[PDB]
Design an enzyme around this catalytic site. Sequence first.
Site, PDB file in Angstrom:
ATOM      1  N   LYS A 148       1.348  -1.086  -0.336  1.00  0.00           N
ATOM      2  CA  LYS A 148       0.234   0.029   0.316  1.00  0.00           C
ATOM      3  C   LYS A 148       0.733   1.160  -0.038  1.00  0.00           C
ATOM      4  O   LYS A 148       1.748   1.087   1.104  1.00  0.00           O
ATOM      5  CB  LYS A 148      -0.965  -0.029   0.676  1.00  0.00           C
ATOM      6  CG  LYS A 148      -1.757   1.111   0.820  1.00  0.00           C
ATOM      7  CD  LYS A 148      -3.128   0.705   0.054  1.00  0.00           C
ATOM      8  CE  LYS A 148      -4.122   0.166   0.805  1.00  0.00           C
ATOM      9  NZ  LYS A 148      -4.581  -0.778  -0.782  1.00  0.00           N
ATOM     10  N   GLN A 177      30.091  21.031  -6.352  1.00  0.00           N
ATOM     11  CA  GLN A 177      30.425  20.079  -6.318  1.00  0.00           C
ATOM     12  C   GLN A 177      31.571  20.633  -4.859  1.00  0.00           C
ATOM     13  O   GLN A 177      31.110  18.984  -3.795  1.00  0.00           O
ATOM     14  CB  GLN A 177      31.466  19.676  -6.892  1.00  0.00           C
ATOM     15  CG  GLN A 177      30.724  19.134  -7.856  1.00  0.00           C
ATOM     16  CD  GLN A 177      30.582  20.043  -9.328  1.00  0.00           C
ATOM     17  OE1 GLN A 177      30.118  21.471  -8.707  1.00  0.00           O
ATOM     18  NE2 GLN A 177      29.976  19.339 -10.730  1.00  0.00           N
ATOM     19  N   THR A 211      -3.412  -5.206   0.500  1.00  0.00           N
ATOM     20  CA  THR A 211      -3.102  -4.299   0.716  1.00  0.00           C
ATOM     21  C   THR A 211      -3.708  -3.502   1.290  1.00  0.00           C
ATOM     22  O   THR A 211      -3.040  -2.791   2.192  1.00  0.00           O
ATOM     23  CB  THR A 211      -2.772  -3.453  -0.937  1.00  0.00           C
ATOM     24  OG1 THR A 211      -4.174  -3.240  -1.796  1.00  0.00           O
ATOM     25  CG2 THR A 211      -1.811  -3.942  -1.871  1.00  0.00           C
ATOM     26  N   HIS A 264      19.814  28.117 -11.089  1.00  0.00           N
ATOM     27  CA  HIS A 264      20.751  29.204 -11.982  1.00  0.00           C
ATOM     28  C   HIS A 264      19.303  30.220 -11.392  1.00  0.00           C
ATOM     29  O   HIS A 264      18.534  30.500 -11.689  1.00  0.00           O
ATOM     30  CB  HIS A 264      20.401  28.620 -13.157  1.00  0.00           C
ATOM     31  CG  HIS A 264      21.424  28.175 -13.442  1.00  0.00           C
ATOM     32  ND1 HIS A 264      22.659  27.547 -13.129  1.00  0.00           N
ATOM     33  CD2 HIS A 264      20.736  26.323 -13.705  1.00  0.00           C
ATOM     34  CE1 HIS A 264      22.723  26.299 -12.864  1.00  0.00           C
ATOM     35  NE2 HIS A 264      21.935  25.587 -13.902  1.00  0.00           N
ATOM     36  N   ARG A 268      28.750  34.946  -7.696  1.00  0.00           N
ATOM     37  CA  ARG A 268      27.416  34.754  -8.372  1.00  0.00           C
ATOM     38  C   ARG A 268      26.547  34.467  -6.689  1.00  0.00           C
ATOM     39  O   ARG A 268      26.433  33.554  -6.114  1.00  0.00           O
ATOM     40  CB  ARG A 268      27.265  33.566  -9.518  1.00  0.00           C
ATOM     41  CG  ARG A 268      27.683  32.271  -8.892  1.00  0.00           C
ATOM     42  CD  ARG A 268      27.683  30.937  -9.476  1.00  0.00           C
ATOM     43  NE  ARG A 268      27.868  29.753  -8.864  1.00  0.00           N
ATOM     44  CZ  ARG A 268      28.599  28.495  -8.986  1.00  0.00           C
ATOM     45  NH1 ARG A 268      28.118  28.209 -10.603  1.00  0.00           N
ATOM     46  NH2 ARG A 268      28.145  26.857  -8.670  1.00  0.00           N
TER      47      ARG A 268
HETATM   48  O1  LIG Z   1      -5.974  -6.956  -7.378  1.00  0.00           O
HETATM   49  C1  LIG Z   1      -5.674  -6.235  -6.516  1.00  0.00           C
HETATM   50  N1  LIG Z   1      -3.736  -6.979  -5.046  1.00  0.00           N
HETATM   51  C2  LIG Z   1      -3.836  -6.914  -3.814  1.00  0.00           C
HETATM   52  O2  LIG Z   1      -2.783  -7.443  -3.717  1.00  0.00           O
HETATM   53  C3  LIG Z   1      -4.825  -5.936  -3.523  1.00  0.00           C
HETATM   54  N2  LIG Z   1      -4.599  -6.103  -2.704  1.00  0.00           N
HETATM   55  N3  LIG Z   1      -6.242  -5.889  -2.046  1.00  0.00           N
HETATM   56  N4  LIG Z   1      -6.642  -5.049  -2.886  1.00  0.00           N
HETATM   57  C4  LIG Z   1      -5.432  -6.263  -3.888  1.00  0.00           C
HETATM   58  N5  LIG Z   1      -6.228  -6.067  -5.213  1.00  0.00           N
HETATM   59  O1  LIG Z   2      29.159  25.095  -9.333  1.00  0.00           O
HETATM   60  C1  LIG Z   2      28.865  24.018 -10.047  1.00  0.00           C
HETATM   61  N1  LIG Z   2      29.331  22.872 -10.843  1.00  0.00           N
HETATM   62  C2  LIG Z   2      29.221  22.805 -12.099  1.00  0.00           C
HETATM   63  O2  LIG Z   2      29.841  21.169 -12.697  1.00  0.00           O
HETATM   64  C3  LIG Z   2      28.844  23.828 -12.892  1.00  0.00           C
HETATM   65  N2  LIG Z   2      28.515  24.000 -14.404  1.00  0.00           N
HETATM   66  N3  LIG Z   2      28.152  24.944 -14.302  1.00  0.00           N
HETATM   67  N4  LIG Z   2      27.682  25.755 -13.364  1.00  0.00           N
HETATM   68  C4  LIG Z   2      28.555  25.302 -12.251  1.00  0.00           C
HETATM   69  N5  LIG Z   2      28.584  25.047 -11.289  1.00  0.00           N
END
Ligand SMILES: O=c1[nH]c(=O)c2nn[nH]c2[nH]1
Ligand SMILES: O=c1[nH]c(=O)c2nn[nH]c2[nH]1
Lengths: 295, 295, 295, 295
Positions: free
Chosen positions: C10, C228, C57, C256, C176
Amino acid sequence: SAVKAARYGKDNVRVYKVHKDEKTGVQTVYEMTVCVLLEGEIETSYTKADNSVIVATDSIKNTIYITAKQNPVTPPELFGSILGTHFIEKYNHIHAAHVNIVCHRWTRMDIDGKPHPHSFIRDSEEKRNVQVDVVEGKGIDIKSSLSGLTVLKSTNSQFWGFLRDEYTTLKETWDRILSTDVDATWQWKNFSGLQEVRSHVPKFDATWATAREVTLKTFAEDNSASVQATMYKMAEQILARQQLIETVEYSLPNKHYFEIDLSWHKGLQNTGKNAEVFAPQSDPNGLIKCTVGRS
Amino acid sequence: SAVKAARYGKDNVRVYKVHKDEKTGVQTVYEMTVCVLLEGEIETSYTKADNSVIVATDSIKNTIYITAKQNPVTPPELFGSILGTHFIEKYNHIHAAHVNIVCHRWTRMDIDGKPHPHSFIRDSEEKRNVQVDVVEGKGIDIKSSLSGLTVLKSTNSQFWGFLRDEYTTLKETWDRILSTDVDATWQWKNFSGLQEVRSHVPKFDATWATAREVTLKTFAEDNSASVQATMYKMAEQILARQQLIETVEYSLPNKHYFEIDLSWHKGLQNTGKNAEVFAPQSDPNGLIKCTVGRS
Amino acid sequence: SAVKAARYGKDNVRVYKVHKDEKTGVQTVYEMTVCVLLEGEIETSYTKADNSVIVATDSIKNTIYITAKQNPVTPPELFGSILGTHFIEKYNHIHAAHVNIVCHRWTRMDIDGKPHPHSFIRDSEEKRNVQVDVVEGKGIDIKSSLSGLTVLKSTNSQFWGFLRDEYTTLKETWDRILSTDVDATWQWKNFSGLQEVRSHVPKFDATWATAREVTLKTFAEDNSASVQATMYKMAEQILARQQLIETVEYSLPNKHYFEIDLSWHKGLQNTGKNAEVFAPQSDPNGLIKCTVGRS
Amino acid sequence: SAVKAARYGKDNVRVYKVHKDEKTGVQTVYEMTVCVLLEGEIETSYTKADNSVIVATDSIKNTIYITAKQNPVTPPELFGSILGTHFIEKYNHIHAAHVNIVCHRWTRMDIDGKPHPHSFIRDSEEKRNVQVDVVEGKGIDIKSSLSGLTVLKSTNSQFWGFLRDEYTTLKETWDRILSTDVDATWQWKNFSGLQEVRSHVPKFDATWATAREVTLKTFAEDNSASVQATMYKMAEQILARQQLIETVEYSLPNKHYFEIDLSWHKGLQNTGKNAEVFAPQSDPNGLIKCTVGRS
Ligand SMILES: O=c1[nH]c(=O)c2nn[nH]c2[nH]1
Ligand SMILES: O=c1[nH]c(=O)c2nn[nH]c2[nH]1
Ligand SMILES: O=c1[nH]c(=O)c2nn[nH]c2[nH]1
Ligand SMILES: O=c1[nH]c(=O)c2nn[nH]c2[nH]1
Ligand SMILES: O=c1[nH]c(=O)c2nn[nH]c2[nH]1
Ligand SMILES: O=c1[nH]c(=O)c2nn[nH]c2[nH]1
Ligand SMILES: O=c1[nH]c(=O)c2nn[nH]c2[nH]1
Ligand SMILES: O=c1[nH]c(=O)c2nn[nH]c2[nH]1
Ligand SMILES: [Ar]
Ligand SMILES: [Ar]
Ligand SMILES: [Ar]
Ligand SMILES: [Ar]
Ligand SMILES: [Ar]
Ligand SMILES: [Ar]
Ligand SMILES: [Ar]
Ligand SMILES: [Ar]
Ligand code: NA
Ligand code: NA
Ligand code: NA
Ligand code: NA
C-alpha cells in the site's frame, strides 16, 4: 463589523457513476469533481456561534452522491441545475447554490478496431466544466467551458507591427510557433428555472462540441496575426452558432518557444528559415484575454 | 573520507525540434525533456576544488541542443545513444554518460477528417521515456518505457481468495472497478556501441508500439484475478514479441473506487449488483510491481 | 517467462498521531505518509492467480494504523523498523518488508512568545524521510534523509577554472548566487534486528539534527568553489560526527539566477558589480550528486 | 460580435533583487512573481489584425525588470502601484494596468545563534500577495493578502448543533481536529494615485504583520464553535486595527481528519477520548468563506 458576503459548502467531491445497458451489455462511465457552495440566511453562524442555520458540508457531500444516484449526471449543465435547485427548494433559509463541476475524460478504448464494452482511457487531461448558479427568484445562470486543451502549431502564426519604443526588444516575425492551453467559456442566456433548463438539454453537448470544433479548426487554419486576432475569430463563430449564448470568453497563455542561435558553434545555422531546434520557455508567458458579445 | 560515487550534469532541458518536408509542406514536431549526467575522473572537483575536470553543466546543455540540430531526435533510444556516445568519446576522462529522455505527445490534428500539415494537440500526459547509459568499455544499456497511461475498466475485475486474518477487513469480490496508471519498462540487451544501436533502429518504435498495444488489450480483455495476474500476462506477451528485450517491468497503482452505502437514505440501493455511484479514492493506493524475464 | 523480482503493498497512507500529556495539558502531533511493500514467496499470485499468498494491500493499510496506535510513531527509523519486522515475523512466507516514511512538519506555534499547548504551523514543505528494509535473515537496513530544504546565498559562491572548448559559452565568475533544494541521505550500518535498533534510538533524531545543521552552516559559510566542493564538505563533516553512519549522499540542483543586461535601456547598469535584479530560471538546472564514504 | 472586455499582458515573470549595504556588508534578497495585464483602446488588435495598439508582452516583461532596477520592490503594494502607474501614464491608449505580485519567502538564516549576512532559507511555502489595479482617473485599488499558511490544532475546536435531516450523517462533536490553509485578504480604501500610496507606505508591512498575527492568535486561542465563527473573529480584529481597510475576506478549507475505529481489531480503543491515530482526508474538504466590513 458585519458580514457583507458569505458562502460555504463542500469542495473537491469526486464522483464516479456507471451506466450498464440491458440489451447491449455496454457500460458507460462518468467521472467528475463537484463543489457546491451555499448562500442565504447564515450570517449568524459567523456572528453568534449559531450552528442551527448550517446545513453541514458533510451533508452537502452526501447530497451530491444521493443526487447522482437519483439522476443522470450528464450533461453537467443539467446535473448542476438539478443539484442546485435541490438546495434552494429544500431549505427555506438557503437562497443560492453555486455548483462547479469538472468532468474528467474517460474515453472508450478501441481494441482490434472495435469499441470495448467496458474499458476506458483518460485520453487527455482536457476538462469540460460548468459553473451553475441557482439563485432563488433569479433563476439559473450557467457558464460552460472547456479547459486544458493544449495545442501547438509549427508555422502560420505571425506577430509584427506592434508598438516599438525604448522598452521594446522583441523582433517582428512573419513565421513563429504558437502554442497555448485553451480556456474557452460560453455564458448561457439566464434560465428561469429547472423546467426551462430541461427544455434545452440537447444544446449543452452540442454547444460544447461546437466550441471545441471551432477552437481547433480556427487555430489550425488561421494564419494568425496575433493571439488577440485568432481568439476573436473563434469567439465570433461560436456566438454565430448558438443563439442561447450571450458571451464567449477566451483566456490564452502564449507559451513561448525561443529560437536558439548556434552560430557561435562551428557556424551552425539554426535561426530564421534555418530554425529547427527551439527552447520551450516554461515562464514567463504572454496572457491574452477577450470576452465577445452580440452588437 | 573519499568519494564513493559521483555524477553530475544538466537536468530538465526542454527541447523542441521541427521537421519540414519541402515537397509536401508537411511539418512534424518533436518535444522532449532531457537529463545528462556524467561520471569519470571527476573526484578532484569535489575534493580539491579542481574545476579543470568539469565539463560545465551549461556546456552540457549547449551540447544537447547542438546534437539535436545535427541528428534526428527520434527514436529517443537512438538520440540518447548518440548524445551519450559524444560525451565518452569527446572527453578522455569521462567514462559514462547517463541520458534520460522524456518525450511529450504532439499528435497531428484532424480538421474535417484530414490530418493538418502543421497543427498538433497534446492528447494526454502519457509519456514515452528512455534511460540510455553509455559506459566506456561496457557498451550501451537502454531501458525504454511508457508512463502516465491512465485506464479504467468498470467490470471484469475480481479479487477473492486472499489471506484473511485478524488484520483483514476487505470483503472478497467477483466484480469491481480496476483503474491504474501504467508504468511499463523494457530493458534491451547490451549493445556494443552506436554502430550496433543504429542497426536496430526500427525495433525501437515497434517495441514501444507493441508494449502499448499489449498493455491496452490485456487490460481490456483479461477477466482479472488480481493486478498481479493481469500485469504478468502483459509482460509475458511483450517478451514473446521481441527477442532483443531481456526483461519487462510493470509498476501499477491500484486506484481504488469504493462503493457508497446509500441505504440510510430513503432505502436507496447502491451496493453490489445495484452499485452505480462510487467514490474514487485519491489515497491510499495499492502498488503492485513485477519484473519478468525469460525462464 | 518467470517472475525475476516482485514486491507489492500500500502506497500513500496518510497517518496522524497525537500525544496528550495529561499532567501538563501539552499535546504534540505527528503526521506522515507511509508506503509498505512486501517480498516473499508470492510469485504464484502473478503466475497462477493464487491469491492465497497475498496479504491484501487493504490489510497492510489496516496494519499501518494498528501499529501506529500500538507504538510511538517517532523516530521514523524506529517506527519503520517495528512495522517492517511485524510483516516478516507474522507471515512465514513474507521475507522482506520495505517501509518508506515521509514525515511532515507541524511546528508548535508561539503565541505572544510562549509555545501554545496544541497549535501548530506547517513551516515549509521540508521533509524528513526514512527507507527501512527489513529482510528475513539479513537484519534491518535504514537510510534516513532530509529533502525539500530550499536555500539561497546572494554572494560567496564562485565558479571558475572549468574545462572550456568549442561547446562552452559560460563565463567564469568569482561572485554569483547559489541556490539549491537539499536532498541529503545517511545510510546506517546494518542492524541485526529490532532489538539492536531500539538500543540506538537517540542517535536517530541527533543524526538528523546534525545533518541539517552541518548542511546549513557549511552552505552559509563556505566560500564555494563549486556545488561539487561545498557538498563534499557537508558530507565529510556528517560522517565524522556519527560513527554508525556508513555513507552520506547529496543530490543538489543548481537553481540558476541569471544576470539581466539592461544597458540597452537608458544605459542602465545591472551586470557584474552592478547586478541587483536577476531572472530566476525555472529550468534547466544543474544537478550534482555525490556519495561519500570512509577511506 | 463586439469585444465587451479585453486585457492582455505578461504572466509568471519571476524577479529577484538583492540589496547590499555599505557600512554593514549585510545583504537582503527579495523574490516575487509578477503579472501585469493591460486594458484600454485595444479592441482593434482583436477585430482588425491591428497590432499597432499592442504594447508587446515581451516589452511589458522588460518593463517589469527595468522598474525593479529603478525602485525598491518592497512593500509590494508600492512596487505594484509604481509599476501600474507607469503603464497608464506612458501610453495614451492604455487606461488600466492590473498588477498581481506573489512574494516568496527568503528568510535570513541564523548560524550559531547570529543572523547570516547573505544566506537565506525558504522557511515556508506561505506567500504574501497584492492585486494592484491602476485605473486612469479612478485611482489605485489595492487588495493585500497572505495565502498558503497551513495550520492545525489538535483540540479546542467543536462542531455541534447544525441542521439534522434525512441527508445528515455527521456526528456532533465537542472536541475535533481543525486544520486549514489560510487565505486572508484585506481591501484598502481607494487611493487617488501614486502620491497617495506613497503617503501610507509603512502601513502596508504593518497591516500584513497584524493580519498574520491576528490569524494565528485567534486560531490558536479560540475554542472554535465552527470555522465560520473563528474566521469572523479574526476579521473583526483586523478591521479594528487599521482604518484604511474597507473589507477583510477569508477563504478557509476544512481539511478533515477522520477518527479511525480499530475496535474490530482486538477491541483496540481509538475513538472519542481514546482517539490517537487519525486518517487525514485529502478530499473532499469543507470550504468556508466570509467577507466582513464596517457596519
Ligand atoms: O489486485 C489486487 N491486488 C492486491 O494485492 C490487493 N490487495 N487488496 N486489493 C487488491 N487487489
Ligand atoms: O557549481 C557548479 N558546478 C558545475 O558543475 C557547473 N557547471 N556549470 N555551472 C556550474 N556550477
Ligand atoms: O466548522 C465547520 N463548518 C461547517 O459548515 C461544517 N460542516 N461540516 N463540518 C463543519 N465544520
Ligand atoms: O529568442 C528570443 N525570443 C524572444 O521573443 C525573446 N524575448 N526575450 N528574449 C527572447 N529571446
Ligand atoms: O468500500 C470500501 N471498500 C474497500 O475496499 C475499503 N477499504 N477501506 N475502506 C473501504 N471501503
Ligand atoms: O546570464 C546568463 N548566465 C548563464 O550562465 C547562462 N547560460 N545560458 N544563458 C545564460 N545567461
Ligand atoms: O500574439 C501575441 N500578442 C501579444 O500581445 C504579444 N506580445 N508579444 N508577443 C505577442 N504575441
Ligand atoms: O470519521 C468520519 N467522520 C466524518 O466526519 C465523516 N463524514 N463522512 N465520513 C466520515 N467519517
Ligand atoms: Ar459522476
Ligand atoms: Ar490563439
Ligand atoms: Ar525534440
Ligand atoms: Ar492491471
Ligand atoms: Ar504519525
Ligand atoms: Ar552547495
Ligand atoms: Ar524581486
Ligand atoms: Ar478557522
Ligand atoms: Na430556499
Ligand atoms: Na572518455
Ligand atoms: Na517471514
Ligand atoms: Na493612459
